[PDB]
Design an enzyme around this catalytic site. Structure first.
Site, PDB file in Angstrom:
ATOM      1  N   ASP A  54       0.811  -1.213   0.000  1.00 27.75           N
ATOM      2  CA  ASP A  54       0.000   0.000   0.000  1.00 27.75           C
ATOM      3  C   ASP A  54       0.849   1.268   0.000  1.00 27.75           C
ATOM      4  OD1 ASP A  54      -1.856  -2.040   0.405  1.00 27.75           O
ATOM      5  OD2 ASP A  54      -2.020  -1.617   2.552  1.00 27.75           O
ATOM      6  N   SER A  79       2.524   7.215   0.092  1.00 23.55           N
ATOM      7  CA  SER A  79       1.644   6.460   0.973  1.00 23.55           C
ATOM      8  C   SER A  79       0.236   6.561   0.410  1.00 23.55           C
ATOM      9  CB  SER A  79       1.696   6.994   2.407  1.00 23.55           C
ATOM     10  OG  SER A  79       0.620   6.490   3.178  1.00 23.55           O
ATOM     11  N   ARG A  80      -0.400   5.430   0.159  1.00 20.08           N
ATOM     12  CA  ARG A  80      -1.705   5.462  -0.482  1.00 20.08           C
ATOM     13  C   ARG A  80      -2.846   5.697   0.488  1.00 20.08           C
ATOM     14  NH1 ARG A  80      -0.668   1.647  -5.198  1.00 20.08           N
ATOM     15  NH2 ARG A  80      -2.931   1.280  -5.260  1.00 20.08           N
ATOM     16  N   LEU A  81      -2.606   5.535   1.779  1.00 20.89           N
ATOM     17  CA  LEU A  81      -3.651   5.849   2.745  1.00 20.89           C
ATOM     18  C   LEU A  81      -3.829   7.353   2.904  1.00 20.89           C
ATOM     19  CD1 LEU A  81      -3.437   2.776   3.464  1.00 20.89           C
ATOM     20  CD2 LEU A  81      -3.824   3.487   5.818  1.00 20.89           C
TER      21      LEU A  81
END
Lengths: 132, 256
Positions: A54, A79-81
């Site tokens: 992720d 960071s994909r969050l």
């Protein structure tokens, strides 16, 4: 490598995450480590893993040899969050800084005919240098 | 990444390598032309000074920043900064600057800025002279200043690399002023061309090293690809020879 080499990793790294209270209620956070060769981030394993995970924290040898420590290349990291992984005050403190750093790197690389710099670009350069 | 792309990159690098030599020839011709023009202007200026002298018988610091901003420009800028710090008294002198960098340098030292311009105004020497000569005449007529000089953040091959600077004032007057400004511009252009020659000489080496790196990478990829293909083909072959190998092993193990 064999053809299984993607699944071999995926079925492993899919065994972590955040779970609901009826199934344990905990959370497994994974930080796998991978080595690239000569900065080639488009290798087979490196890319297989960027596709299963992720996000990525890319460490740069050029920054390491220059004395920067940790030698994290924020331009090549992600960071994909996003702010969903942050608290409210931390999300507001760093709401739009990564885009500013990307723009600062782009502006530093870019070559233009005009000898003068627009004020927005100068502010972006100041902010990027201060962020570094 | 096939051999077609490597060949295209190679031919592009070769084309740029030849064009650099052609540009070097052109720049040398331009330098010779500018040298001839400057010598003629110097002779005419000497004659004009002689004729004016026969007819008759606080400092203003003008600062100009470099054309571009590279490492050389930054080094020259900081040396100009120390020269300003060692050769200006703010309480008694006035400084006019053109360009953001020298304007900032003047600002940080709290100097008195007459006005701020755009750097490209320096490119048009005629308008530049017609403006700042009249400004300097209006100034020295009011006795606000009586010393005028020019400094550029640029290196001179005559001063062992030091900055180009000239104290024009104190030494039909306006024609002499224009001639002096034209001579200063021509000197700057000559120095710029002399630097450009070495810059092209550096670019050639950069292209050569780029070509070497590209060739190394291409060969490194090709060898691995070929080895993998051959290994796959022989594995496909050797799958079918298992039975004979097992039979031979069993016959050998049976004994005799």
């Amino acid at each position: 490598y064999p053809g299984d080499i993607f699944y071999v990793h995926s079925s492993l790294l899919e065994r972590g995450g955040k779970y609901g209270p009826e199934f344990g209620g905990g959370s497994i956070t994974i930080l796998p480590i991978a080595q690239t060769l000569a900065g080639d981030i488009s290798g087979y394993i490196p890319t297989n893993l960027i596709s299963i995970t992720d996000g990525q924290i890319y460490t740069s040898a050029k920054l390491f040899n220059e004395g920067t420590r940790p030698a994290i290349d924020v331009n090549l990291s992600v960071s994909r969050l996003g702010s969903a992984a942050q608290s409210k005050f931390m999300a507001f403190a760093s709401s739009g800084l990564k885009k500013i750093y990307t723009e600062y790197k782009y502006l530093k690389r870019l070559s233009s005919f005009s000898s003068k710099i627009s004020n927005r670009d100068l502010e972006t350069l100041q902010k990027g240098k201060a962020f570094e | 990444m096939k051999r077609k792309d490597v060949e295209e990159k190679k031919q592009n690098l070769d084309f740029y390598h030849n064009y650099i030599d052609i540009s070097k020839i052109k720049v040398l011709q331009k330098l010779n032309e500018e040298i001839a023009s400057l010598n003629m202007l110097k002779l005419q200026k000497g004659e004009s000074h002689y004729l004016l002298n026969r007819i008759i018988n606080k400092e203003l610091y003008i600062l100009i920043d470099p054309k571009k901003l590279d490492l050389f420009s930054e080094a020259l800028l900081r040396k100009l900064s120390q020269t300003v710090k060692e050769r200006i008294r703010p309480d008694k002198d006035f400084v006019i600057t053109v360009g953001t960098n020298v304007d900032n340098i003047a600002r940080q030292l709290n100097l008195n800025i007459i006005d701020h311009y755009d750097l490209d105004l320096f490119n048009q020497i005629d308008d530049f002279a017609n403006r700042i000569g009249e400004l300097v005449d209006v100034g020295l007529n009011n006795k606000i200043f009586n010393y005028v000089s020019l400094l550029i953040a640029q290196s001179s091959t005559k001063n062992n690399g030091g900055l180009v600077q000239e104290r024009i004032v104190p030494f039909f007057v306006k024609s002499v002023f224009k001639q002096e400004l034209f001579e200063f511009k021509s000197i700057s252009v000559i120095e710029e061309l002399k630097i450009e020659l070495q810059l092209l000489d550096e670019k050639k080496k950069r292209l050569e090293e780029q070509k070497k790196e590209l060739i190394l990478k291409w060969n490194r990829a090709r060898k691995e690809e070929a080895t993998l293909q051959s290994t796959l083909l022989f594995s496909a072959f050797k799958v079918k020879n298992q039975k004979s190998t097992r039979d031979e092993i069993l016959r050998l193990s049976k004994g005799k």
